[PDB]
């Protein structure tokens, strides 16, 4: 408070969290969701407003077509981020943008130009006096407290490992696949078709992905747990709606995580993610195999589904070769993993070096951000 | 330990950058 | 494993095999997983010892 | 309540199951106390 | 919630026990892979006499 | 362009006959050449170095003549008597010449404790040997050396006469011979303390021909007095041949030396507190979430709904292990819309056809 | 000789050429894919097979999985490469295999018991009565009109540059690196990521391959044209998609062979193909030299880029000797070469010797081809 602290906020596709430099938790974490109101108003003299934003926009779940900005981790409507980013700085932090510097996080593959994009709404609008954006993956292995090896970070908008050396990564061994949660939930809801439950609207996919954060696991074998459930009924629980239905989603609770290890299902070309990181280890040299075979480290909100690390370990122990030893790094806090390498990243002496003065934007255009940030 | 080493290895990024 | 080892000269037997070694086996191993490990200031001389 | 007496349990049977493994190590050390013994038997005899 | 937290702490500083435990063990069987490898080289030596 | 060759090579022999030490031995020997020729103090073909195996049956192990040191391997050496005869022919296929080793059989014939015998013929050690004066203990190699003895050589140990007069003259403990205008001798109870010796009586001497060149005379060079300085356990020369071997080895050759004490290699690691724990411990399926159970008539076959509440099976599952199996694989295009026009254009023709009857109307036709 | 033909069949890592020695053109070209549906086909009549193979199988593109036979010059399939050449001597050309010699093609460095699994294929299924294996390189000479000379190749499989001497393989300056089109095609992606075009399915990549084909060209100079693309939009093209929406490549036409000069930006430590000629040409002898500057022959499909020839001329003049003889010599059709080679070796008198017999076979083994063709 007595100095300028650099705010932290981590911005992905599902969920946007935000906090100051050098704090050990975030202060503010809500959906990224901007709502407007579709059905007739009439009540005069009481409130209503022509867009929610926020955990407000969740409330209001009944009366809203809920809308996100950030599609595929890509940000596809600039004003409903610009939205997300006021309600963020002043609803949330209540704090002004101008006096502190902030610090952003973004997808390793993207499009050049949102970059640019968010340089320029940041520095014009909000006259922050500096930022610096840092890839998302490389600031799980810094909180994870280790300098070399692999990660995987699958959010909600999409699924990325790269692998890391010396704490500095490598551009072409990086592997991007576009295959998250968000495409989970809509398999869920697909595949919840068939025993008669239907769920169509906004809201109801928002039920489903309630659905799938309380009654989801992955199966260590597919073959002989779907065995098992053609077996008894031992594998049945029952999840009570908001409208006071009760319904057993039973067989389906490892059919849908199941869609990351086979994305042939969804009927996408690409294989799953353990073969994925395995083509990304291998694609690297010889001589660093060793060490990122003994320090994989898995992030992200989607990692988080019961058992993922024992089928994880197992597919990439088949596929690796016999002699070498295999060990996955899952840390309890990794959904917030991300934010708290942001944490340390503004903390470091050397790093007041990097940010990027608002005379240099001034100077340079919005196209300082590709030779400054790496 | 580990803080001062992440401190020499962001000095060689902008060593090596420009 | 075929080490190629150079040829040497007549009164040139030394530099040959020291060069052969040099290029099999690199003088600075901790570099990887291992450099944490080590102080930064100590790893440094140890290199140039 | 819920939360707290799933976590007590679980850390039981983990101190349990650590108890169990102090046993497999000091089998383990035990054992090289043999390994280093005997090879240095080996080479003894070898050395004569 | 109270005869929860006091759980949580011991049990941390529990895992952080066993770790020490754990890695020991990984030392242990290698080092005997390396010397019963090492006593079947000598006993093979014995044998050639 | 790869010019090394396995020194060992007894893999590829398969032949003769050999001792229990033999191997030993023969690598021994063969690795000595080899570190003669890569110091560069010896170069082409002689009888430099000899070995006895054998205290109570001689056989000793001397070179071929015509083989440089760089070629030598240990099948290609020659087994003889204490006489000289040829009583092993060696593997390699040379004419066989035993002239030199006669002053080498003089030696053995002297001293019964010797086992290894090494002659050096280096420019720096012929320098000392024609030199009048003794070496002097100029050098800490020398002073490391110990005791010598000189013997006039006049080139030639045929005679009984010289085999007479050497063994006086060599002593009966005595470890360094200096055969004047010709080099010197160095005697081992083993090879590696015959190989040290060697290493340091040949540094000494270039460290006495550099000093007694440059500074003139005897009086510049302040030289000091011998007396005044007057696992298991090691044994001389045993680190330094158990390193070279190592090194050696190292480079891809295959030596049979083995170790006394063996080395081992290891990384290690630092436990950091930082660091988080490791924490370890085609088909497609269509599902059915019921169960049928067949029920017998109360013949017709039933079938159950079998419901929840009796503990049936939850999710039925079916598998299609490869794609298209609901079509038949081979199948013409074309009859399908032939099909399609013909059943089409009875439209076109408007036909006055009705369905078919059942044969119990025709039957009472 | 007279009533029968020798096959000139030529089996590339990309396409497959077929024809009668003799003849100025082949009479049939087409890819080297095999396909399998990916799909339920729910059409009952309309018929389906297991898997197409060529060019029927390249116009369903979106209902396939592509796999090639043949990968990095190393056969990975062979009942695949079985269906290749049924596919070859039954569909396009309706000749019996029975009836005609055949004359097949190989890399100048390939494992032996690849050529004995290639003989030992073509005379026990196919019964054919003759067959002769000849190096790929080596055919190119002969087209060119040449016997001195040294042969730069480039493929879909491998790039690899040989030294002839009066028809004369020097085996130990054969030089082998891997530069492919199809590497080329991975990194065009890898770039068109940037602009916000994605490509991820075996579909697309011929997409990717067919603008690689028709819009790119090498610059004389990298650094002036990176400024000179940087300046001004001239050098911006569009291109048409099959879905019919349009792209502009822009910056990237002169990004895509450049990893050819410069192979670290594929992240392979290896030297360039200059530098790789100018090796091979370092390991001969003397007295050969004078004429290996002064005769050069490119050859291969990766070698139609416009402008490759300027450029190649200039990189090795920096490398060579001073006042030097260099020159390049590129056939207009230099991937067509190979084949044209072929057909010109079968039609010699003096090349009748070379037929191995079906008895020679049946007494000597598939080991017969090494001793017989060296
Ligand atoms: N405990 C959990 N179990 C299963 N899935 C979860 C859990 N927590 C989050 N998820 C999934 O992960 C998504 C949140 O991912 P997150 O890491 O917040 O994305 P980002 O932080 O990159 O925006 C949610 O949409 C949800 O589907
Ligand atoms: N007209 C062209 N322009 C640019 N590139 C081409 C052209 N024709 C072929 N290529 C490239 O050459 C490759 C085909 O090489 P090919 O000659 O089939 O190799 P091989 O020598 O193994 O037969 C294709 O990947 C394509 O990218």
């Given at each position: ?246 319904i057993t989603i039973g067989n389906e609770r490892f059919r849908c995580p199941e869609a990351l290890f086979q994305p042939s299902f969804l009927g996408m070309e690409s294989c799953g993610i353990h073969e994925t990181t395995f083509n990304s280890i291998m694609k690297c040299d010889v001589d660093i195999r060793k060490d990122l075979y003994a320090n994989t480290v898995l992030s992200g909100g989607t990692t988080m589904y019961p058992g993922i690390a024992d089928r994880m370990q197992k597919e990439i ?58 | ?18 | ?49 | ?34 390994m280093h013994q005997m090879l240095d038997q080996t080479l003894l005899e070898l050395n004569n | 919630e109270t005869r929860a937290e006091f759980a949580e702490r011991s049990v941390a500083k529990l895992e952080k026990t066993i770790d020490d435990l754990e890695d020991k063990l990984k030392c242990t069987k290698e080092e005997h892979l390396c010397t019963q490898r090492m006593l079947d080289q000598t006993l093979l030596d014995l044998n050639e006499m | 362009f790869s010019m090394m060759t396995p020194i ?358």
């Amino acid at each position: 408070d007595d100095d300028i602290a650099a705010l932290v906020v981590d911005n992905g596709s599902g969920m946007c969290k935000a906090g100051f430099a050098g704090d050990d938790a975030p202060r503010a974490v809500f959906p990224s969701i901007v709502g407007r109101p579709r059905h007739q108003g009439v009540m005069v003299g009481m409130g209503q407003k022509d867009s929610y934003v926020g955990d407000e926009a969740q409330s209001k779940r009944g009366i809203l077509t809920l809308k996100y900005p950030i599609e595929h981790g890509i940000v596809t409507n600039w004003d409903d981020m610009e939205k997300i980013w006021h309600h963020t700085f002043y609803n949330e932090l209540r704090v002004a943008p101008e006096e502190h510097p902030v610090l952003l996080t973004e997808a390793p593959l993207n499009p050049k130009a949102n970059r640019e994009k968010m340089t320029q709404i940041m520095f014009e609008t909000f006259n922050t006096p500096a930022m610096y954006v840092a890839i998302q993956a490389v600031l799980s292995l810094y909180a994870s407290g280790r300098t070399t090896g692999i990660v995987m970070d699958s959010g909600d908008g999409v699924t990325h490992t790269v692998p890391i050396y010396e704490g500095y990564a490598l551009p072409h061994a990086i592997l991007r696949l576009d295959l998250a949660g968000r495409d989970l939930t809509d398999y869920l809801m697909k595949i919840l078709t068939e025993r008669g439950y239907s769920f169509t609207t906004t809201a109801e996919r928002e039920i489903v992905r309630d659905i799938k954060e309380k009654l989801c696991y992955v199966a260590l074998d597919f073959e002989q747990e779907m065995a098992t459930a053609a077996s008894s009924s031992s594998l049945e629980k029952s999840y009570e709606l908001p409208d006071g239905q009760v319904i057993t989603i039973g067989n389906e609770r490892f059919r849908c995580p199941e869609a990351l290890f086979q994305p042939s299902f969804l009927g996408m070309e690409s294989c799953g993610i353990h073969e994925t990181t395995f083509n990304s280890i291998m694609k690297c040299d010889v001589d660093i195999r060793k060490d990122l075979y003994a320090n994989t480290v898995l992030s992200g909100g989607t990692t988080m589904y019961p058992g993922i690390a024992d089928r994880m370990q197992k597919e990439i122990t088949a596929l690796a070769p016999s002699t070498m030893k295999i060990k996955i790094i899952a840390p309890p806090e990794r959904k917030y993993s991300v934010w708290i390498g942001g944490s340390i990243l503004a903390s470091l002496s050397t790093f007041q070096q990097m940010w990027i003065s608002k005379q240099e934007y001034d100077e340079s255009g919005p196209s300082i951000v590709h030779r400054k940030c790496f | 330990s580990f803080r001062e080493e992440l401190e020499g290895l962001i000095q060689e990024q902008m060593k090596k950058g420009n | 494993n075929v080490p190629n080892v150079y040829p040497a000269a007549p009164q040139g037997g030394m530099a040959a095999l020291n060069m052969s070694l040099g290029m099999v086996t690199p003088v600075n191993d901790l570099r990887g997983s291992d450099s944490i490990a080590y102080d930064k200031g100590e790893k440094l001389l140890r290199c140039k010892l | 309540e819920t939360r707290a007496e799933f976590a007590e349990r679980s850390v039981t049977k983990l101190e349990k199951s650590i108890d169990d493994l102090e046993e497999k190590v000091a089998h383990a050390k035990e054992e090289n106390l043999s390994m280093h013994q005997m090879l240095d038997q080996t080479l003894l005899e070898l050395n004569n | 919630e109270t005869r929860a937290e006091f759980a949580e702490r011991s049990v941390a500083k529990l895992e952080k026990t066993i770790d020490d435990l754990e890695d020991k063990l990984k030392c242990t069987k290698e080092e005997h892979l390396c010397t019963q490898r090492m006593l079947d080289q000598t006993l093979l030596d014995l044998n050639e006499m | 362009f790869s010019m090394m060759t396995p020194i060992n090579d007894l893999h590829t022999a398969d032949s003769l006959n050999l001792a229990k030490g033999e191997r030993l031995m023969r690598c021994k020997i063969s690795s000595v050449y080899r570190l003669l020729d890569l110091y560069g103090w010896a170069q082409l073909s002689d009888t430099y170095v000899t070995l006895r195996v054998s205290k109570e049956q001689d056989h000793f192990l001397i070179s071929p003549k015509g083989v440089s040191c760089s070629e030598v391997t240990a099948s290609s050496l020659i087994k003889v008597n204490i006489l000289g005869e040829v009583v092993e022919k060696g593997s390699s296929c040379f004419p066989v010449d035993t002239t030199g080793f006669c002053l080498h059989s003089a030696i053995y014939a002297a001293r019964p404790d010797v086992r290894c015998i090494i002659h050096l013929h280096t420019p720096a050690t012929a320098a000392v040997s024609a030199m009048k004066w003794g070496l002097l203990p100029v050098s800490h190699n020398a002073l490391l050396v110990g005791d010598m003895a000189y013997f006039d050589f006049n080139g030639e140990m045929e005679q009984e006469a010289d085999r007479i007069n050497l063994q006086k003259c060599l002593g009966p403990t005595c470890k360094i011979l200096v055969l004047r205008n010709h080099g010197v001798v160095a005697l081992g109870d083993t090879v590696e303390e015959a190989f040290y010796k060697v290493f340091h009586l040949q540094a000494a001497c270039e460290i006495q021909v550099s000093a007694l060149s440059s500074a003139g005379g005897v009086e510049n060079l302040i030289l000091l007095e011998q007396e005044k300085h007057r696992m298991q356990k090691s044994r001389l020369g045993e680190h330094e041949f158990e390193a070279l071997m190592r090194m050696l080895d190292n480079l891809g050759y295959r030596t049979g030396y083995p170790y006394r004490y063996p080395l081992v290699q290891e990384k290690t690691k630092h436990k950091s507190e930082v660091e988080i724990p490791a924490t370890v411990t085609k088909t497609r399926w269509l599902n059915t979430p019921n169960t049928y159970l067949r029920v017998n008539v109360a013949p017709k076959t039933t079938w159950m709904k079998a419901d929840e509440v009796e503990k049936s099976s939850s999710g039925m599952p079916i598998r299609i292990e490869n794609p298209n199996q609901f079509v038949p694989l081979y199948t013409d295009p074309q009859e399908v819309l032939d099909m399609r026009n013909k059943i089409r254009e009875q439209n076109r023709q408007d036909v006055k056809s009705a369905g078919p009857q059942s044969q119990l109307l025709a039957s009472v036709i």
